Amino acid sequence: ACTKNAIAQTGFNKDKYFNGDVWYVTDYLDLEPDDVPKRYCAALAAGTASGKLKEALYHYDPKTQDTFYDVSELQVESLGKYTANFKKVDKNGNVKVAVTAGNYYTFTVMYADDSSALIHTCLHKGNKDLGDLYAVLNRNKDAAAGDKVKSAVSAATLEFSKFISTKENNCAYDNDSLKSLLTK
Ligand code: FDE
């Protein structure tokens, strides 16, 4: 179940966030913690491709090796808050599972600057969801969370100390496939 109406950053700069580059998840918190493994790797590219707002996603479970990519088309609900379809694709953009009405996530950018961000998502796959999931992002896959984003976690009435880090999982990312997937 999702329970939070996440508030988007005041004065969110959409063109900077959606610049075509990659964001790495460095830390995450699910309010239903059993919905996601204790060890995980994830990243995303976000950009406009031929006028369309897009996100490409990568998930990797470093223990099981479960791997998947997704291409997402975002619709705007308000500045910094989106609803996103998703099609599961291979790294080259070939469709494995097509878009369908029932498969979507909400996505809210709660804080962003040029190098870090805090987002919330609520994933739906039919009648199931993956709970409220918060993620701290960085442009540098190895960056420890700095004061701006940690303060934003506190401003959302969360505690950064409770977030689970991805840094000890030997995560390795295909940045090229995330960037190319934006077009697919
Ligand atoms: C730790 C983590 C982190 C993250 C992040 C993220 C972001 C930022 C966004 C997202 C989204 C998503 N996811 Fe996410 N994520 C996670 C997790 C996860 C998991 C475990 C999964 C699976 C579920 C199932 O159902 O199986 C996912 C999942 C997911 C999805 C689905 C895909 C397919 O195709 O199926 C999506 C769309 N994710 N995501």
Query: Does any ligand 1 atom lie closer than 6 A to the CB of residue 171?
Result: no
120 is in an annotated binding site: no
Query: Does any ligand 1 atom lie closer than 6 A to the CB of residue 42?
Result: yes
Domain around 116:
1-184
Can you tell me which atom of ligand 1 is nearest the CA of 137?
8
Distance between CA atoms of residues 17 and 3, nearest Å: 25
Distance between CA atoms of residues 47 and 69, nearest Å: 16
Q: What is the DSSP letter of 9?
A: P
Can you tell me which atom of ligand 1 is nearest the CA of 128?
25
Query: Does any ligand 1 atom lie closer than 6 A to the CB of residue 70?
Result: yes
Probe target for ligand 1 pocket from 28, 57, 122, with the most ligand atoms within 8 Å of CB: 57
Burial class (CB in 10 A: 0-12, 13-18, 19+), 126: exposed
Chain Cα centroid distance, residue 58: 9
When divided into structural domains, the chain yields a total of: 1
Q: Which CATH number fits the domain that encloses residue 175?
A: 2.40.128.20
109 HSE (CA, 13 A, CB side): 26
What tokens appear for 98 in the block? 């097509």
Expressed in angstroms and rounded, the spacing between residue 152 Cα and the centre of ligand 1 is 23
Neighbouring residues of 80: CB distance < 8 A, sequence distance ≥ 6:
8, 9, 12, 14, 108, 109, 110
Neighbouring residues of 44: CB distance < 8 A, sequence distance ≥ 6:
22, 23, 25, 55, 56, 57, 58, 137, 178
Asked whether 22 and 41 are in contact (CB, 8 A), the reply is: no
Expressed in angstroms and rounded, the spacing between residue 59 Cα and the centre of ligand 1 is 7
Asked whether 91 and 184 are in contact (CB, 8 A), the reply is: no
CA angle at residue 175 from 170 to 176, to 5 degrees? Answer: 140
Query: What is the residue with the minimal CA distance to atom 20 of ligand 1?
Result: 36
Query: What is the residue with the minimal CA distance to atom 17 of ligand 1?
Result: 36
